[PDB]
Amino acid sequence: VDANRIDYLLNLVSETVITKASLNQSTIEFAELYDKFQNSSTIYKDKTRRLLDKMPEYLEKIQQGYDINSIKQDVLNEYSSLLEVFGDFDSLMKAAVTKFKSSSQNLGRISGELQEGVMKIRMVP
Amino acid sequence: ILRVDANRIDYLLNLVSETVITKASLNQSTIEFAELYDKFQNSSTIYKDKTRRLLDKMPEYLEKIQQGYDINSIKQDVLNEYSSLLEVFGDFDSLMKAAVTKFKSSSQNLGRISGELQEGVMKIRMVP
């Protein structure tokens, strides 16, 4: 066999180990993203329960003549942040998907090269 | 200008086959996470619509109770908005966790295969 053909196979395996390292890093990124979603989900579900449980106190104040605008001020000040409870989940997720897709596609390219290269040595008599 | 063992080349073929299988599984995991991103985006839009509606309704509904509206209808509608909001992402947390678990499994398998490929390809090289 050609010496340079075997050195190409060694270089492809080197590319595989690097791609393996990047894919491992991607598993950690997606585990972190799962944790972030799970935490934000539990937090919003807990906080929205607290909001509903607060409503009778707001009613008591209104019944005593408290300004409804002050109630609105209290509600929005405490609870409007619910809108952002997931933080940067979506942008972090999109970036992690893009990075994972690139590494996975590169692995496909390497594996195709490995397949054809080793298959062509299997064809030498 | 190199000599290689035929049987070791067939062994490397089986390692490359395992690599291709793992790659196909990793590709499906990229699609799974892309689907989950899209699902999060769609459900997050609904989540914000529902949260804005609940926040707007609460002071309005307090005023309506004071104006003499049927209080049960107010309580019921708040609870109905609240349960819709609690369920807006459905089983996303479980689906995301399962997707991470599958990806971790295939990634670890790739690490094992890559170690075997490294030793396998280096040992086919014989002199003269």
Residue numbers in the entry:
A (entry chain A): 5 to 129
B (entry chain B): 2 to 129
Give the original sentences from the paper that presented this experimental model.
The main components of the system are transmembrane chemotaxis receptors called methyl-accepting chemotaxis proteins (MCPs), the histidine kinase CheA, and the adapter protein CheW. CheA functions as a dimer and possesses five domains (P1-P5) with distinct roles in autophosphorylation and array integration. The P1 domain is the phosphate substrate domain, P2 interacts with response regulators, P3 is the dimerization domain, P4 binds ATP, and P5 interacts with CheW. Here, we used cryo-ET to examine the in vivo array structure of the pathogenic spirochete Treponema denticola (Td), which possesses the highest native membrane curvature of any bacterial species examined for its chemotaxis system so far4,7.
Sequence alignments of Td CheA with CheA homologs from a variety of model bacteria with previously characterized chemotaxis systems indicate that, in Td CheA, an additional ~50 residues join the canonical dimerization domain (P3) helices. Analysis of non-redundant P3 domains from all CheA classes reveal general sequence conservation in the canonical helices but highly divergent sequences at these additional residues. Furthermore, CheA-F2 proteins contain the most residues in this non-conserved region. Interestingly, aromatic residues (Phe, Tyr) cluster near the helix breakages, and unusual core packing of these residues allows for maintenance of a coiled-coil register despite a disruption of helical heptad repetition in the C-terminal helix. The net result is a distortion in the alignment of the hairpin tip, the consequence of which is currently unknown. Different orientations of Tyr83 in the two subunits produce asymmetry in the added tip region. However, a linear arrangement of CheA is present that generates “strands” of rings interlinked by the CheA dimerization domain (P3). Furthermore, the Td CheA P3 domain is clearly discernible in the sub-tomogram averages, which has not been previously observed in vivo. As the CheA:CheW rings have to undergo substantial bending to accommodate the baseplate curvature, the elongated P3 domain may have evolved to stabilize CheA dimerization by increasing the interface area. Because of the high membrane curvature, the receptor trimer-of-dimer modules are expected to be further splayed, and the elongated P3 may compensate for the increased distance between receptors and P3.
